[PDB]
Design an enzyme around this catalytic site. Structure first.
Site, PDB file in Angstrom:
ATOM      1  CD  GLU A   1       0.651   1.818  -9.260  1.00 37.82           C
ATOM      2  OE1 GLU A   1      -0.195   1.108  -8.681  1.00 37.82           O
ATOM      3  OE2 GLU A   1       1.621   1.341  -9.890  1.00 37.82           O
ATOM      4  CB  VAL A   2      -2.339   7.077  -3.944  1.00 39.60           C
ATOM      5  CG1 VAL A   2      -2.430   7.527  -2.492  1.00 39.60           C
ATOM      6  CG2 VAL A   2      -1.931   8.239  -4.837  1.00 39.60           C
TER       7      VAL A   2
ATOM      8  CG  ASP B   1      -5.150  18.449 -11.492  1.00 41.78           C
ATOM      9  OD1 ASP B   1      -6.052  18.461 -12.365  1.00 41.78           O
ATOM     10  OD2 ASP B   1      -4.628  17.393 -11.068  1.00 41.78           O
TER      11      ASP B   1
ATOM     12  CB  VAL C   1      -6.299   4.172  -1.364  1.00 46.31           C
ATOM     13  CG1 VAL C   1      -6.245   3.245  -0.164  1.00 46.31           C
ATOM     14  CG2 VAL C   1      -5.104   5.116  -1.360  1.00 46.31           C
ATOM     15  N   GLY C   2      -5.567   4.553  -4.636  1.00 52.43           N
ATOM     16  CA  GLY C   2      -5.735   5.451  -5.763  1.00 52.43           C
ATOM     17  C   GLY C   2      -4.659   5.293  -6.811  1.00 52.43           C
ATOM     18  NE  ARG C   3      -6.966   4.535 -12.276  1.00 54.98           N
ATOM     19  CZ  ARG C   3      -7.956   5.395 -12.046  1.00 54.98           C
ATOM     20  NH1 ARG C   3      -7.752   6.471 -11.295  1.00 54.98           N
ATOM     21  NH2 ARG C   3      -9.152   5.181 -12.580  1.00 54.98           N
ATOM     22  N   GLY C   4      -3.181   7.287 -10.829  1.00 51.99           N
ATOM     23  CA  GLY C   4      -3.296   8.346 -11.814  1.00 51.99           C
ATOM     24  C   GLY C   4      -2.182   8.188 -12.827  1.00 51.99           C
ATOM     25  CE  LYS C   5      -2.927  13.171 -16.910  1.00 52.21           C
ATOM     26  NZ  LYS C   5      -4.147  12.970 -16.071  1.00 52.21           N
TER      27      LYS C   5
HETATM   28  C1  LIG Z   1      -7.527   8.736  -5.917  1.00 54.71           C
HETATM   29  C2  LIG Z   1      -7.724   8.377  -4.586  1.00 54.71           C
HETATM   30  C3  LIG Z   1      -6.761   8.737  -3.644  1.00 54.71           C
HETATM   31  C4  LIG Z   1      -5.609   9.444  -3.993  1.00 54.71           C
HETATM   32  N1  LIG Z   1      -4.654   9.810  -3.097  1.00 54.71           N
HETATM   33  C5  LIG Z   1      -4.860  10.115  -1.787  1.00 54.71           C
HETATM   34  N2  LIG Z   1      -5.770   9.437  -1.090  1.00 54.71           N
HETATM   35  C6  LIG Z   1      -5.949   9.735   0.195  1.00 54.71           C
HETATM   36  N3  LIG Z   1      -6.873   9.054   0.921  1.00 54.71           N
HETATM   37  C7  LIG Z   1      -7.678   8.063   0.452  1.00 54.71           C
HETATM   38  C8  LIG Z   1      -7.933   6.967   1.275  1.00 54.71           C
HETATM   39  C9  LIG Z   1      -8.800   5.962   0.847  1.00 54.71           C
HETATM   40  C10 LIG Z   1      -9.415   6.033  -0.403  1.00 54.71           C
HETATM   41  C11 LIG Z   1      -9.149   7.112  -1.243  1.00 54.71           C
HETATM   42  C12 LIG Z   1      -8.285   8.114  -0.805  1.00 54.71           C
HETATM   43  N4  LIG Z   1      -5.226  10.691   0.761  1.00 54.71           N
HETATM   44  N5  LIG Z   1      -5.197  11.176   2.039  1.00 54.71           N
HETATM   45  C13 LIG Z   1      -4.275  12.157   2.165  1.00 54.71           C
HETATM   46  C14 LIG Z   1      -3.667  12.333   0.917  1.00 54.71           C
HETATM   47  C15 LIG Z   1      -4.298  11.377   0.031  1.00 54.71           C
HETATM   48  N6  LIG Z   1      -4.114  11.083  -1.267  1.00 54.71           N
HETATM   49  C16 LIG Z   1      -5.421   9.785  -5.331  1.00 54.71           C
HETATM   50  C17 LIG Z   1      -6.375   9.430  -6.285  1.00 54.71           C
END
Ligand SMILES: c1ccc(Nc2nc(Nc3ccccc3)n3nccc3n2)cc1
Length: 328
Positions: A47-48, A151, A40-44
């Site tokens: 990876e999430v 940040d 669902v996400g990514r960064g340097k």
């Molecule tokens: C970009 C996107 C998400 C994150 N991390 C990230 N993303 C989420 N939720 C989420 C669900 C679906 C789509 C996007 C986010 N959460 N939810 C709680 C902590 C967290 N961290 C980090 C960078």
């Protein structure tokens, strides 16, 4: 000799074990308890993925960390544990690692976010006040616990627009505040870097986060993402100067006896202050009310000591209806 105007002695009064994150002895959980469902996400730095706790079958967030110093990982963990339970603070549920590679993963409660690039444009005037207010609860809370996020930006603010829930995430760059301590200015993301970071003023504090918040706020009401669009650190300061004016910058530099790099000082040049209303147009007219401008104006100040504190920001009349609804 700069210091925070509030919560300056929080870590001074608490046991060394509260802020001494290098003494932390991580208690690793069970790697298999959590499974990846979808990225669902990514960064340097990581990876999430949206995940699932195999035990209870409830959703979760799996933040797999990229290679990084042991010191930095204990810092994010300690900060997450110290803030766990606070208003709108992401909740760290578990910590696990891959036996073979030692790749660590942090498990967080789930939040169904909506990409800000798509969400923000649909937020109403009231939605902006509501969400900025909620983000403010998170900042006043972490600051009251002696921690700077460092940040603050849309990407680190998870918003479930359906449930109107907000969470401040990614404390990977956060740090404990200690009076007089000189911190690294290589924090935050360029568009949200405050003047202190751009002119190398190391003894900064919670106020750094308020400038970032101010950048987010300005982008929302003026419908301009990002508000200060610079290409590198030098250009980031130039974009700010062309708006706030160079007199304020020179006054700032003199107050803290700071000398700008000859090159930087050349790029910045000389610019008059541009009134916040010159940024209003038919696309943002329905969001740039006088209370919004007064509020934004008190956040985007060169001097970090002049900016409103998170607590003060919350009491600004701009949020009067949000507070009234809450106290009902
Ligand atoms: C970009 C996107 C998400 C994150 N991390 C990230 N993303 C989420 N939720 C989420 C669900 C679906 C789509 C996007 C986010 N959460 N939810 C709680 C902590 C967290 N961290 C980090 C960078």
């Amino acid at each position: 000799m700069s210091k925070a105007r509030v919560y300056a002695d929080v870590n001074v009064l608490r046991p060394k074990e509260y802020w001494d994150y290098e003494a932390l002895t991580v208690q690793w959980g069970e790697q298999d308890d959590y499974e990846v469902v979808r990225k669902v996400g990514r960064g340097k730095y990581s990876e999430v993925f949206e995940g699932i706790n195999v035990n209870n079958n409830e959703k979760c967030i799996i933040k797999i960390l990229k290679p990084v110093k042991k010191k930095k990982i204990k810092r994010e963990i300690k900060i997450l544990q110290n803030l766990c339970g606070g208003p709108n603070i992401v909740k760290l549920l578990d910590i696990v690692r891959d036996q073979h590679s030692k790749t660590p993963s942090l498990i967080f409660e789930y939040v169904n976010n909506t990409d800000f690039k798509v969400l923000y444009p649909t937020l109403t005037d009231y939605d902006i006040r509501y969400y900025i207010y909620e983000l403010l609860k998170a900042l006043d809370y972490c600051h009251s616990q002696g921690i700077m996020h460092r940040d603050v930006k849309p990407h680190n603010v998870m918003i479930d627009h359906e449930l109107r829930k907000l969470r401040l995430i990614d404390w990977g760059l956060a740090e404990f505040y200690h009076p007089g301590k000189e911190y690294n200015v290589r924090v935050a993301s360029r568009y949200f870097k405050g003047p202190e970071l751009l002119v190398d003023l190391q003894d900064y504090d919670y106020s750094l986060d308020m400038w970032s918040l101010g950048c987010m706020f300005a982008g929302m009401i003026f419908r301009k993402e990002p508000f200060f669009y610079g290409h590198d650190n030098h250009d980031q300061l130039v974009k700010i100067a062309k708006v706030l004016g160079t007199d304020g910058l020179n006054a700032y530099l003199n107050k803290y006896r700071i000398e700008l790099d000859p090159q930087l000082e050349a790029l910045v040049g000389r610019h008059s202050r541009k009134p916040w209303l010159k940024f209003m147009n038919a696309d943002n007219q329905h969001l740039v009310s006088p209370e919004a401008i007064d509020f934004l104006d008190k956040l985007l100040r060169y001097d970090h000591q002049e900016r409103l504190t998170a607590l003060e920001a919350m009491t600004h009349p701009y949020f009067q209806q949000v507070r009234a609804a809450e106290n009902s």
